[PDB]
């Protein structure tokens, strides 16, 4: 497919900026075990290296997802909407 996916995991922002909730782009999607309000979430790169900062996270897999960090869904607010 393009890099389009890839060039805005580049610029450092998270997914749902570019999917919102009604698409499924493709790239690695971690869960947030200390955020779990949603019980398998799905957040992208930067929002795990950022918003989760020292949370209990794991890597899950390469897949189509939306991120829930990005959507608001989490039990905290996502630090790349807008703070
Ligand atoms: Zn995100
Ligand atoms: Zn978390
Ligand atoms: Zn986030």
């Known amino acids: 497919g393009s890099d389009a996916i ?3 995991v580049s ?5 749902y900026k570019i999917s919102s ?3 499924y782009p493709m790239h690695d999607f971690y869960r947030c075990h200390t955020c779990n309000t ?3 979430n799905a ?8 918003c989760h900062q020292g949370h209990d996270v794991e890597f899950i897999r390469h897949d189509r997802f ?5 959507a608001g869904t989490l039990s905290n ?3 790349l909407a807008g703070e």
Not at 11 to 15: A, F, I, K, P
Not at 66 to 70: E, L, P, R
């Open 21 to 23: 909730y009604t698409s």
């Open 38 to 40: 949603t019980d398998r």
């Open 11 to 15: 610029r450092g922002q998270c997914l």
């Open 66 to 70: 939306f991120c829930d960090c990005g």
């Open 43 to 50: 957040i992208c790169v930067n929002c795990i290296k950022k």
């Open 77 to 79: 607010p996502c630090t």
């Open 6 to 8: 890839e060039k805005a």
